[PDB]
Design a protein around this ligand. Structure first.
Ligand SMILES: [Zn+2]
Ligand SMILES: [Zn+2]
Ligand SMILES: [Zn+2]
Ligand SMILES: [Zn+2]
Length: 259
């Protein structure tokens, strides 16, 4: 049961960039195309139903997306046999509507009859963003105004520490000492071996993973969409300089603490 990334209402449709949207919000997403009930992009004028003009979006997500130009992927054919496809896991727009492809024991599982289907993969740009949750969680978050001794006192084994780059991830691992992590695939840096115990250290672009308390290292330098993705699922304790395009808009609303 998918919910609208803007307002939280039931979302039968999705943007090309991966945001779920309700009937209303199909027409307020200027960033990229939204295929609607008639099968055409909203406001395209391909038929009577998609003739009405688009509106300008009023979510700060829409402001963030002004700096992220939509790059449309090429149409690829999804071969399906015995409920399996060669195409990677993800969400795809087809003539049967939206279709999910999930990794399983046998391979990439997809709930479609045997055949070949023209498909357009949705981008991960706005994957799992929920602005209703962001508005709630940001007010119960905290930006903490090196002072790594503070982090060691507060951090626990069940916590998760998100971090922007491979370099910042490496430096966080050295500062913590004993900690769990997965070494990023295709990295030029020399990471140490992950311990059996300790707090998890995860690369920000990997998205949200369940944890007790969550931290955002160098929050001012972090990708805006990834931050929103994180605040869609949990409150954060943000770290580093407040400022150093600019930092994400959420940090103007977020409560602060010194020391
Ligand atoms: Zn909506
Ligand atoms: Zn979009
Ligand atoms: Zn139409
Ligand atoms: Zn600001």
């Amino acid at each position: 049961s998918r919910m609208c990334g803007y307002c939280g209402a039931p979302a039968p449709y999705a943007t090309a960039c991966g945001l779920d949207v309700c009937v209303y919000h199909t027409h307020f997403h200027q960033h990229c195309p939204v295929i609607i009930w008639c099968g055409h992009p909203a406001g395209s004028g391909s038929c009577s139903e998609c003739e009405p003009p688009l509106g300008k979006g009023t979510s700060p997500l829409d402001e963030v997306l002004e700096q992220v130009p939509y790059k449309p992927p090429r149409t690829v054919i999804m071969h399906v046999e015995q409920g399996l496809t060669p195409l990677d896991p993800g969400r795809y727009q087809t003539r049967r509507g939206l279709v999910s492809v999930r990794r399983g024991i046998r391979g990439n599982e997809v709930d479609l009859p045997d055949g070949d289907y023209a498909s357009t993969a949705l981008l991960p740009t706005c994957k799992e963003i929920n602005m209703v949750a962001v508005a709630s969680n940001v007010l119960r978050s905290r930006f903490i105004i090196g002072k790594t001794h503070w982090l060691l006192q507060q951090v626990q084994d069940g916590d998760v520490i998100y971090t922007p780059t491979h370099q910042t991830m490496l430096d966080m691992i050295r500062a913590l000492g004993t900690c769990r992590f997965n070494v990023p695939a295709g990295t030029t840096l020399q990471f140490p071996a992950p311990s059996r115990t300790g707090p998890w250290v995860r690369i920000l672009a990997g998205g949200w993973c369940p944890g007790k308390n969550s931290f955002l290292d160098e929050a001012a330098y972090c990708n805006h969409l990834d931050v929103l993705r994180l605040l869609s699922k949990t409150t954060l304790t943000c770290l580093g300089d407040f400022k150093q395009d600019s930092h994400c808009y959420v940090f103007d609303i977020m409560p602060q603490t010194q020391l």
